[PDB]
Structures are given as C-alpha cells and as structure tokens.
Amino acid sequence: HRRYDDQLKQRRQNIRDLEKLYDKTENDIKALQSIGQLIGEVMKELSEEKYIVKASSGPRYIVGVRNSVDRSKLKKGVRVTLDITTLTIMRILPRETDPLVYNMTSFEQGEITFDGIGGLTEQIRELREVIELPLKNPEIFQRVGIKPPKGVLLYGPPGTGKTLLAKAVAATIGANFIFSPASGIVDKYIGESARIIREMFAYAKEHEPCIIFMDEVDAIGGRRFSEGTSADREIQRTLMELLTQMDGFDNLGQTKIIMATNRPDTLDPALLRPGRLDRKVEIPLPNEAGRLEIFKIHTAKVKKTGEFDFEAAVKMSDGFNGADIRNCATEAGFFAIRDDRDHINPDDLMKAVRKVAEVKK
C-alpha cells in the first residue's frame, strides 16, 4: 500500500504539469475577438479626446479613443494601443524603446577585473576625472561655469590597450554600458542609421549612469573630398544627426563620448572640436613602469617554476603591446606541450619574446 503512496504524490505533481500548460492557451482561444493591436504614438493634440496618431506599422491612420483611460498619459511622446478593425485607443502602454541587440547590448559592463591592458597611471586616471565628477557632486563645474566635458579620443593600433578599455574601465564605474557597433547600425535596406541611436538616448534621460562606447569606427572618418561616392554619400549625411547630439537640445554630462580610429587621416574635423573631443589617449611603448601591471596578470595565469627574472625581458620588448605580451607565454607554452610539463623556463619565455619581434609589421 505504501508503494503507491510516493508514486501518487508524483502523479499529482504531474497533473499540475498536465493542467497549467494548456490553461494559458485557453485564454488565447477566447482572445480571437480581440486582434493584436498595432503600434502607435501620440503626435499632436487635435480634438478634445481624439488626437493625431501615425502608426509606425503603415500609413497614417487617426483612430478613435476609449474612456478606460484619461488624457494625462495621452500627451505627445508615448506609445499607445490602436486597434486594427475598430480603430480606437484601447489602453495606455508604457513607452517602449525596442531594446534590440543593437539598441541595448545584452553584454553590459564586464565580468573582468581591472585593466590587464593598462598600467599607465596618468592617462587612465585622467579619463576617470571627467567621468566620476558629475556622477556624485558636479559642484566643480558650477564655480568654473563650464559645460561638463564628454570628450574622449583614442588613436592607435586597435584592440591593443585601446578597445578593451571599455569592457574594463567602464565596467567598474557602475554605469550602464551599451555597446554600439558600427556594423549593426548600417541597415543596408532603407537605413534608419542615426535615428536608431536617437532612441538609445532615452535610457540616458531615464538612467543617469549610462555610458556609450563607439568601437573602432574609421568608416565615417573619410570625408571624400571628391564626393564621387555611391552608398557613402548617405554616411556623411547620417553622421550629421550624430553631431546634433553634441550640438542641439541634448545636454547631460552623463553619457560619455568615446570614438576610436586607426589613423589620423582625413577624419572629419568638426567632430574633433576641442569641445567634442578632449582627452586624447595615445598608445605608446612605455617603460617597465607602464607594462609592470600587465606582467603581474600575465604571471598569475601561467603556472610554472618559482624562479624567473622578467626585468631583463623588459629591455627585450621592442614594438610590443598588451596583445604582444600575451603572445610571449602563448608561444613559449607551445614548446612545453610535448614536454609533458607546464613549467616555463625564463630563457624559453625570452625565446618567444624575440620571435614576436621578427613577425612585427
């Protein structure tokens, strides 16, 4: 009799799995009377209740209204609910910015600790002074009487001490980090382009700690003095809307302006204005003091013998960057794979240091 006691309890738990599933589908069976409503937004007030609303799902259709809601939330700049057939306003939904993958990146801030590409104290901390100042007390710019600088410029080799600063420095600030790819805003067919980015600033007005990072964009750089382009004439055209955010009604001091480029070529001088771009962080080849903090993280990853001298390897570095430092133990560790040991001799590591200097450029 006790054999079924434990089984019937599992059957009752299965009945709930055999019940609550279709229970949500039955509400959709009775929902055939109400068709899924389209998209709409209030534009300009016209009559008492009914206003002018253009549906983004098609041509211009002015629908009716319902008394279930009032005109407090019916003002301009809010999403509404319009029926397909009856053509009325059902209820008031909250304004939706469509947080797509390119609208708001699912990857935010980072899972990584402090700079592994860093080690320059003067330049890295120089960026944090124009960031953390408005975050807590913006009382310094009040006595000076100046607008908070958003300018950040990065020029040099991409991906080496340059790209990863976004996923590292901005991750520890505790602010919203939205990755903004240049290949996601192209929109090859009827490009929305910069109009997509305009919808992204809605998070800045809602959430103050918001950081926007443009990742290695040389595409908008060339101004094409000949102007013989085909699809690139729209690019200089869509760039002017991006300049409006640095020009027109939008003034915040929270969202930071960061744009990176490979080379100081024909790049548009207007965006280079000393008001638009301020901090310019070069990617030089510093001494041991600059690469010291990189070697510590570089050492903690590799498990090897406790006898090593990295001071002589600093002089061995010529034209090497944060990415080339990883190459050192990467190639040196390959020689120990067939040796059935994870220990890396200090001379074996220096052999890979010279090997990167041969493949340079």
Partner: protein, 287 residues
C-alpha cells in the same frame, strides 16, 4: 614597523633644543616621506608625522616652525588629509598664549596655500581663523577690509555641501556691513540660502538670528514695510515652539509697524487675531 625606533628620537626633544631637531631630526622626517610619496595614500599611518610637528611647537619659537611647515606643503606632505593635523593641531597651542603671537599667527595664515586658492582641506576651520582675525581687527580699527575676507572664502570650503558651517559666516559678515554703515552691502551677501531653512525641520535659534539683522539693514533705509515681513516667521515660531514670554513683546512692535504701511494683501489677514485680545490693553488699543 619602522615607528618603533622613532621613540628613541624623542629623547633629544626634551633636553636638547628643538633647533637641532629642525635639521638632524628633519632628516628622519624626509625618510618617512620618501617611503610612499604619490604611489599610494596611506602605507602605514599619517598620525606620527603630525605628532612630531606638535612636539616642535611649544619648544622652539614659532618663527622657525612656520618655515618648516612651508616646505612641507610645497611638495607632498604624505596624505592630503595629513596636512590637516600637521597645521590645525599645531594652532591649538596658540590659543593658550596669543599676546605677541597674534602678529606671528598672521604669517601662519598666509603660510598655508589654501587661503588664496582652495586645494584639498574643505573644513571651515581656516575660515574661523580669519574670522577670529577679523574680531582682532575690529578692536584695532579695521573695517573696510573685514567684509572682503569672509565674502568669497565661505564658498571655497563648502559651496553646496554644509550650510550649517556657512550660517555663522554670513551672519558675521552682515554684521560687518552694519558697523561699516552700508545697508545695501549685506542685502546682496545673503542670496542662495533663501528660504531653504524653512524647508527643513525647525532649528529654532537659527531663524531667530537672520530676521534680527535684517531689521537693522532696514533701519538705515527706514523702510517699515520690509520689517513687518521679517517679523512674520518669528511670529509663528514663538507661538508654537516657545511660550508667550518672548512672543508678546515682539507682537507689540509687529502691529505697531502695520499702521506704518498702507495696509496690504497680507496685512488684510493680519487684522483679526485670536491671541491679541488679552494681556496688554495697548495691544487691544492697537488692535
């Protein structure tokens, strides 16, 4: 740590004069400063360096120590918060002497770099040093130069931060304009504070001060309309918090000033009062 051997350096501070400690013992002070510099904030402790400076105060003359603190502020001086205790705490010994050291303290005021431009120290204690210097200048006959010291100095410490420490500075500066003879000066000096005190829980004697000095400003102008407005908030203050002991004699001059103005939009509601129908008959006569 390395602070165990410093106790052996306190023996010459007793017998030998402190002038020898300005050189020999200064070398040890430079060694402790070179252990950190700008690499980090506090490696071990910043209090020992401030304690040694305190021991060099009451020993030698104040002219030699004033020059020692000059070089310490030119470069680093350990943590920026350690500069606070290496100076402030030293001034505690001057409070028990003064006399001929008042003119010497003037050089100490100009010795620090935070009087001309605000660097790190945000507290109003240095402004109180100049504030106490004004009180000394008030007895010496200096007037015109008193108001200019406390004008832009209160903003350098806490601009938006702490209003309570800013209260005593605005009140004293407005009194300097009264003794100077310019009523329009102190009117502009108090602006940003506005009514924000009324938007905070009632602190009593604060609101009982400003309105006392604002009537003295209108005394030179002889304007009786603004005086009735400054007697308003204190009229409801003594009728709620305090008793009628100080509430009645103030009301005697409140309704006395209402006859001095051609009524008003607010004065029309000041006609009938519940609590003015008793006690003095002249309060009834004015009613």
């Amino acid at each position: 740590k390395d602070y165990s051997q410093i106790l052996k350096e306190e023996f010459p501070k007793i017998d030998s004069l402190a002038q020898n400690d300005c050189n020999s013992a200064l070398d040890q002070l430079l060694v402790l400063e070179k252990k950190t510099r700008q690499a980090s904030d506090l490696a071990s402790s910043k209090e020992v360096l401030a304690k040694i400076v305190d021991l060099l105060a009451s020993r030698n003359k104040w002219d030699d120590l004033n020059e020692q603190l000059t070089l310490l502020s030119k470069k680093h001086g350990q943590l920026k918060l350690s500069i606070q205790y290496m100076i402030q705490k030293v001034m505690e010994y001057l409070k028990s002497s003064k006399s001929l050291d008042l003119n010497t303290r003037i050089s100490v005021i100009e010795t620090i770099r935070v009087v001309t431009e605000n660097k790190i120290f945000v507290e109003v204690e240095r402004a109180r040093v100049t504030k106490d210097l004004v009180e000394i200048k008030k007895e010496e006959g200096k007037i015109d130069e008193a108001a200019d010291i406390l004008c832009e100095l209160q903003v350098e410490t806490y601009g938006s931060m702490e209003m309570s420490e800013k209260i005593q500075f605005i009140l004293e500066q407005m009194e300097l304009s009264i003794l100077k003879g310019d009523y329009s000066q102190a009117t502009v000096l108090s602006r940003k504070i506005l009514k924000k005190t009324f938007k905070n829980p009632k602190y009593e004697s604060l609101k009982l001060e400003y309105y006392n000095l604002l009537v003295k400003i209108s005394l030179h102008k002889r304007e009786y309309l603004e005086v009735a407005q400054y007697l308003q908030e204190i009229y409801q203050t003594d009728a709620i918090k305090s008793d009628e002991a100080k509430w009645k004699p103030v009301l005697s001059h409140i309704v006395y000033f209402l006859v001095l103005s051609p009524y008003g939009n607010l004065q029309n509601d000041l006609i009938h009062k519940i609590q003015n129908d008793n006690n003095l008959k002249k309060l009834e006569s004015q009613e």
